[PDB]
């Protein structure tokens, strides 16, 4: 799943 902490947005 999208890594919110790294990407900042999902």
């Amino acid at each position: 799943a999208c890594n919110l902490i790294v990407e900042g947005h999902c």
Partner: antibody, heavy 117, light 113 residues
Amino acid sequence: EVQLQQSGPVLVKPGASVKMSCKASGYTFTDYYMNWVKQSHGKSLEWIGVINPYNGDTSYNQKFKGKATLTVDKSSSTAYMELNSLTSEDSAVYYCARYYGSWFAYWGQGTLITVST
Amino acid sequence: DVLMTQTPLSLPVSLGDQASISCRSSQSIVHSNGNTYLEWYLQKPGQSPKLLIYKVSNRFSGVPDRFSGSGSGTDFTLKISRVEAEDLGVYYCFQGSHVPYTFGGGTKLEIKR
């Protein structure tokens, strides 16, 4: 001077729900993601999910999908976790833990949930 | 999920000794952006966990330099030099590179006397 103060321990019945809080002080609440972590007695730590207080975005460990719901109230600088459909397996200490580039740089003191009749 | 395997489960160490804790991941912890989000925590009896090391080898503010983190890819090590009695507790490795984030099972540091 960062402090995360979690709400007090709670005894709740199987099948019920419970909502616990994590009150942030000493920094700008919206600046950093807030994580939640479960620790069952004598067991390892488990990551439940993360919320961005800036905009309410969330990301969950699928193990806790439909078990845990993360929210924030920006005006009160408080993060919340609500657990539903409680079973004995949900008896644990629950921590909020704040991001700082690192994942869990500051931890609350934990909230002890006991699920029992 | 990425599995984090710590060894040993229990680590007895004398005051002033060096303790070494191993953490191996089931797949590389190097993120596509090049960072390795491998961290080490200590949970002392009755307390919340506390951050010691982030991004493999970086000490959090206030952590003394006798704690050192090393390794890369799938194999990581925490070395605690000049062990003090107050170092006892359970040490955890942790990866944030892959969702869901996962913890190692813990290593209980015991003081020999």
